[PDB]
Amino acid sequence: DISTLPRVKVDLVKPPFVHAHDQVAKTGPRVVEFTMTIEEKKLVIDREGTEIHAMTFNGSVPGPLMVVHENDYVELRLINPDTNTLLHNIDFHAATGALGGGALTQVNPGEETTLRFKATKPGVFVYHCAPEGMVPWHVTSGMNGAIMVLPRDGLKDEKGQPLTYDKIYYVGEQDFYVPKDEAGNYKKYETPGEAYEDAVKAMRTLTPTHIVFNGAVGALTGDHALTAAVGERVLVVHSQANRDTRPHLIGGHGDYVWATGKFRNPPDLDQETWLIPGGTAGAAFYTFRQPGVYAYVNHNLIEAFELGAAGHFKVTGEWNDDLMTSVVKPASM
Amino acid sequence: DISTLPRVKVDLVKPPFVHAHDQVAKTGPRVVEFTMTIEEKKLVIDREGTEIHAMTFNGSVPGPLMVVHENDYVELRLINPDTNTLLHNIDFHAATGALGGGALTQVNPGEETTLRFKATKPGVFVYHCAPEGMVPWHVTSGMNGAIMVLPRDGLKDEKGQPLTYDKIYYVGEQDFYVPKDEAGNYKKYETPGEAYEDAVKAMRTLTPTHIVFNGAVGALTGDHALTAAVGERVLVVHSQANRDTRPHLIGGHGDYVWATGKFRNPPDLDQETWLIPGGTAGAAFYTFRQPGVYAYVNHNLIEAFELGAAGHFKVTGEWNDDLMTSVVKPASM
Amino acid sequence: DISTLPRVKVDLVKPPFVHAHDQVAKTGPRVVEFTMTIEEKKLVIDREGTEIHAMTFNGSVPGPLMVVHENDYVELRLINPDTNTLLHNIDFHAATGALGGGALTQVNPGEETTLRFKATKPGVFVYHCAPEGMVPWHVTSGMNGAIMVLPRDGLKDEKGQPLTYDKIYYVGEQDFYVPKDEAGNYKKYETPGEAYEDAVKAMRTLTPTHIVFNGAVGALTGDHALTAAVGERVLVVHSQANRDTRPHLIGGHGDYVWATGKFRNPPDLDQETWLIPGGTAGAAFYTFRQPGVYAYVNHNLIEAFELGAAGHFKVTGEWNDDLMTSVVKPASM
Numbered sequence: 001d002i003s004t005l006p007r008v009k010v011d012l013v014k015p016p017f018v019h020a021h022d023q024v025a026k027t028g029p030r031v032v033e034f035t036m037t038i039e040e041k042k043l044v045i046d047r048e049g050t051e052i053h054a055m056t057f058n059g060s061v062p063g064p065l066m067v068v069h070e071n072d073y074v075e076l077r078l079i080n081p082d083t084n085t086l087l088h089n090i091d092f093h094a095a096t097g098a099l100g101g102g103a104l105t106q107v108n109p110g111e112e113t114t115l116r117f118k119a120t121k122p123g124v125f126v127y128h129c130a131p132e133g134m135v136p137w138h139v140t141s142g143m144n145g146a147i148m149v150l151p152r153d154g155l156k157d158e159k160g161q162p163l164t165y166d167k168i169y170y171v172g173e174q175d176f177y178v179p180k181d182e183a184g185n186y187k188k189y190e191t192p193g194e195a196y197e198d199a200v201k202a203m204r205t206l207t208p209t210h211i212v213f214n215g216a217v218g219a220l221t222g223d224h225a226l227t228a229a230v231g232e233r234v235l236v237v238h239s240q241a242n243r244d245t246r247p248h249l250i251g252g253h254g255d256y257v258w259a260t261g262k263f264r265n266p267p268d269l270d271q272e273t274w275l276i277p278g279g280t281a282g283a284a285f286y287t288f289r290q291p292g293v294y295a296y297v298n299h300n301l302i303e304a305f306e307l308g309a310a311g312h313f314k315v316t317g318e319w320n321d322d323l324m325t326s327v328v329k330p331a332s333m
Numbered sequence: 334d335i336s337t338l339p340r341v342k343v344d345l346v347k348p349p350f351v352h353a354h355d356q357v358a359k360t361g362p363r364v365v366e367f368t369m370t371i372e373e374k375k376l377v378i379d380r381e382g383t384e385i386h387a388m389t390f391n392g393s394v395p396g397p398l399m400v401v402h403e404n405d406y407v408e409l410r411l412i413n414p415d416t417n418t419l420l421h422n423i424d425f426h427a428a429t430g431a432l433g434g435g436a437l438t439q440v441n442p443g444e445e446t447t448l449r450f451k452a453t454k455p456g457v458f459v460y461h462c463a464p465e466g467m468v469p470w471h472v473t474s475g476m477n478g479a480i481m482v483l484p485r486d487g488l489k490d491e492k493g494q495p496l497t498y499d500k501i502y503y504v505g506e507q508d509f510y511v512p513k514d515e516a517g518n519y520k521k522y523e524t525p526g527e528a529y530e531d532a533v534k535a536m537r538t539l540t541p542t543h544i545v546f547n548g549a550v551g552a553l554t555g556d557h558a559l560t561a562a563v564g565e566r567v568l569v570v571h572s573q574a575n576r577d578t579r580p581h582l583i584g585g586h587g588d589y590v591w592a593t594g595k596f597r598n599p600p601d602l603d604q605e606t607w608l609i610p611g612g613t614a615g616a617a618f619y620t621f622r623q624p625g626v627y628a629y630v631n632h633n634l635i636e637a638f639e640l641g642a643a644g645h646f647k648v649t650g651e652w653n654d655d656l657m658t659s660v661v662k663p664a665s666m
Numbered sequence: 667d668i669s670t671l672p673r674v675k676v677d678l679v680k681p682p683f684v685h686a687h688d689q690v691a692k693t694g695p696r697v698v699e700f701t702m703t704i705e706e707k708k709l710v711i712d713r714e715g716t717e718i719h720a721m722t723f724n725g726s727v728p729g730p731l732m733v734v735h736e737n738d739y740v741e742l743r744l745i746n747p748d749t750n751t752l753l754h755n756i757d758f759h760a761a762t763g764a765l766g767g768g769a770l771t772q773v774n775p776g777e778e779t780t781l782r783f784k785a786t787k788p789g790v791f792v793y794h795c796a797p798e799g800m801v802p803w804h805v806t807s808g809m810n811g812a813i814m815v816l817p818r819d820g821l822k823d824e825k826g827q828p829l830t831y832d833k834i835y836y837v838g839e840q841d842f843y844v845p846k847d848e849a850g851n852y853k854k855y856e857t858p859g860e861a862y863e864d865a866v867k868a869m870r871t872l873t874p875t876h877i878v879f880n881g882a883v884g885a886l887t888g889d890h891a892l893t894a895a896v897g898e899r900v901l902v903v904h905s906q907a908n909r910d911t912r913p914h915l916i917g918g919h920g921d922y923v924w925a926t927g928k929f930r931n932p933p934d935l936d937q938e939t940w941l942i943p944g945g946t947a948g949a950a951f952y953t954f955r956q957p958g959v960y961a962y963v964n965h966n967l968i969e970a971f972e973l974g975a976a977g978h979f980k981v982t983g984e985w986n987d988d989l990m991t992s993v994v995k996p997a998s999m
């Protein structure tokens with residue numbers, strides 16, 4: 001009986017950060033309430049100042065990561081303010097029935113709705129907008145995120161021993177298809193409704209103009225690099241709602257990887273690079289052994305270094321020469 | 334001694350349906366005879382009335398699914414009527430030797446041949462035409478199907494307990510590369526021999542013009558949606574002879590997935606989306622928990638909703654509110 | 667203490683061959699010294715005589731395969747002669763820290779350097795050049811190879827029983843992006859520095875002009891096909907530094923496949939085709955059961971047969987009719 005369950009309200013954080021949660025559940029099954037407000041906005045996505053009309057959950061690309069446990073109930077209230085122009089909805093890959101909630105959540109601007117579903121399967125999953133006849137348009141404009149459904153006893157390794165992470169980050173990778181003039185210059189629009197027909201043409205090439213982490217080229221660099229220390233255990237959640245990607249930590253590994261993101265499966269060990277199919281969320285666990293700068297990339301290196309799919313980790317701590325050392329520094333021969 | 338074995342003749346059905354078979358073998362090893370007749374024909378592949386010259390096994394795209402057990406012998410008689418214009422053959426990914434049968438099955442129009450091979454490895458596999466110097470041309474014109482080699486004791490889960498399916502469907506996904514005029518209009522040809530040189534140019538872009546299930550855009554919709562009921566266990570066999578795909582059931586999951594299609598491996602559990610490499614057949618097992626319409630798609634959503642890679646399931650039965658419910662229907666805010 | 671360890675010098679061979687090594691280590695942990703000399707050169711990559719400026723490790727595409735055991739130390743001396751024009755470096759996916767060695771190995775022409783790292787994780791891994799701001803350029807010009815880190819007790823099957831291979835081959839697959847004139851003709855340059863800006867434009871289409879094994883179209887054919895005999899156990903190491911590939915042996919299988927190349931994981935069994943993500947090395951083990959010609963391909967068949975990703979195996983020995991036979995040879999109907 002659902003009225004007898006505990007309720008908890010969770011206030012969501014902006015990616016790549018993740019809202020507070022427990023790995024091992026310290027309570028029984030709850031009804032966990034979240035609220036998201038849809039926000040259509042102008043977004044500057046590269047260093048040349050290219051501008052798209054983004055469709056966002058809670059004003060970010062990607063949408064924020066929601067974290068529950070297995071057999072909790074998720075109760076999302078979804079708000080479309082009348083300052084938006086389009087009909088929107090939500091489809092949870094984590095849910096069972098009604099096109100993932102899509103059929104039940106259709107909100108015109110100035111409407112709201114509340115959905116409940118039981119999270120019956122543990123793993124990281126994609127959520128995304130999916131209105132009838134305009135699904136790729138909304139998803140490739142940034143209207144996607146993820147949800148993590150932890151097992152009630154947390155994560156385990158390929159042996160079934162606990163794996164406890166010290167930090168967790170969420171990396172949403174997004175393929176944009178910006179329309180181009182005859183000479184290849186990026187076009188600009190005043191309304192998202194304006195862009196539509198050119199967007200369909202652009203998408204149909206299957207060749208994105210940009211692929212970025214956290215909504216912009218260099219969004220996870222320098223000032224905004226991800227931080228860790230040597231000896232910390234980090235979980236990186238990574239989603240792609242529409243296209244395949246192949247993550248890789250430069251100077252590191254995926255010690256434990258769930259490449260298709262479902263925790264009832266044993267992880268893959270010692271991965272250099274892993275494939276996350278389009279429409280999936282995955283997770284990699286790593287213990288940092290060395291300090292310094294790392295690059296985290298999609299390892300189609302054209303997609304990384306030309307199109308924008310690259311971020312940084314800056315890691316404090318002691319250097320270990322047994323692992324690696326320069327015997328002879330670069331010198332005249 | 335092969336003359337002492339039982340023979341059985343099987344008459345094949347048109348996809349997405351599958352010919353009658355036993356999951357658990359009720360006989361010892363058999364020689365199972367099938368016949369296929371090749372058919373070059375005109376095919377209308379989208380709602381605008383675009384026409385290709387298809388090269389088919391038994392008049393369908395995809396070719397029909399053949400079902401045997403491990404260590405049965407497959408004896409295929411292959412017929413190329415003199416109403417066709419090209420040389421054809423067959424390559425079974427399930428077989429060992431002679432380029433999968435390709436080297437032994439080269440038939441000019443008005444020829445026939447019979448091949449036998451032992452099915453030594455259990456799984457779903459691709460078969461396809463592969464004549465010398467024209468292989469992608471024949472495969473991307475629709476000349477591919479699959480064969481399922483069941484273990485003699487049927488399917489098992491990640492624990493080795495029986496998995497029994499109630500229904501089974503075969504979804505062949507096909508990338509077409511239709512040649513285009515200077516303005517991007519789809520060209521038309523009278524003979525397949527006419528199309529050849531433009532086809533090579535089209536294929537070389539690596540960008541398909543269409544990606545469809547069962548030979549046409551919307552072939553598995555409305556009138557022709559796949560059916561099931563709540564509580565039935567359904568096996569979906571899905572092949573792609575030439576290009577990667579990433580299936581996903583909208584509103585559902587792959588409870589048990591063999592993404593690369595080989596049953597001696599344990600399945601992957603609780604998959605939202607899975608990757609089937611080009612040149613492979615895979616299989617997903619699902620128990621429907623809710624009634625209603627589901628969409629089954631390639632989850633590059635551009636490929637699904639713009640290019641044609643989408644089908645429907647319509648599922649009869651009782652709704653379960655514990656799994657999902659609308660708390661507040663979309664309403665004025 | 668590292669000064670007390672044995673040293674061994676290994677002289678590397680040109681792919682697809684692999685330098686002598688032991689599967690089971692007959693010594694304790696060693697410091698294994700290799701030397702590579704970088705070589706920028708002109709390369710003819712197809713039968714039309716298209717010419718690129720290749721950037722190579724030791725004069726080949728791919729670079730040679732290095733073979734060590736787990737917890738050996740790799741000590742590479744890297745030489746950039748002053749007959750080259752670019753700055754280069756090396757990034758080992760097998761190593762931990764300093765962007766895989768990249769940060770420590772930056773050598774201008776006429777410089778050298780020596781790197782040591784401990785190989786702490788068993789598997790096949792990619793190595794490649796990765797200088798700041800020009801990474802895809804160097805990698806797609808051919809500046810990549812692989813290293814195999816065997817477990818000290820060699821390979822095991824999904825049960826943990828020994829797997830011993832009789833032969834081993836290394837197949838490096840390379841995507842080239844040759845720049846094209848307005849009419850689609852392949853341009854030619856005198857210096858690699860000349861090509862740069864057109865290369866960036868070419869790469870950004872994400873559509874390679876060629877995809878080849880061992881540096882050229884038909885490099886592993888006829889004269890240069892890979893050899894084996896019926897009953898031999900062959901290990902095929904296959905890498906792609908930048909783009910996904912889907913290997914497949916025509917007429918055969920991957921009896922045991924590590925598709926992401928890491929040996930602490932159990933292999934996948936009976937694979938028809940497997941996915942190697944871009945930025946990864948994988949390995950397939952097969953026992954040949956039949957003699958004759960086999961084709962080994964990327965099973966996007968356009969990529970194989972139009973763009974160059976196809977090689978041959980020619981296999982001596984006795985034919986087994988129980989596995990496959992022609993009952994009726996192609997004949998008039």
Ligand SMILES: O=N[O-]
Pocket residue numbers: 248250251299301757758759766796
């Ligand atoms: O080794 N990273 O490109």
Ligand SMILES: O=N[O-]
Pocket residue numbers: 091092093100130581583584632634
């Ligand atoms: O959740 N399906 O696109």
Ligand SMILES: O=N[O-]
Pocket residue numbers: 424425426433463914916917965967
């Ligand atoms: O069956 N090989 O294309």
Ligand SMILES: [Cu+2]
Pocket residue numbers: 055087088089129130131138143
């Ligand atoms: Cu939307």
Ligand SMILES: [Cu+2]
Pocket residue numbers: 091093128279581632
């Ligand atoms: Cu989806």
Ligand SMILES: [Cu+2]
Pocket residue numbers: 388420421422462463464471476
């Ligand atoms: Cu054919």
Ligand SMILES: [Cu+2]
Pocket residue numbers: 424426461612914965
């Ligand atoms: Cu094939």
Ligand SMILES: [Cu+2]
Pocket residue numbers: 721753754755795796797804809
């Ligand atoms: Cu270089």
Ligand SMILES: [Cu+2]
Pocket residue numbers: 248299757759794945
């Ligand atoms: Cu790399």
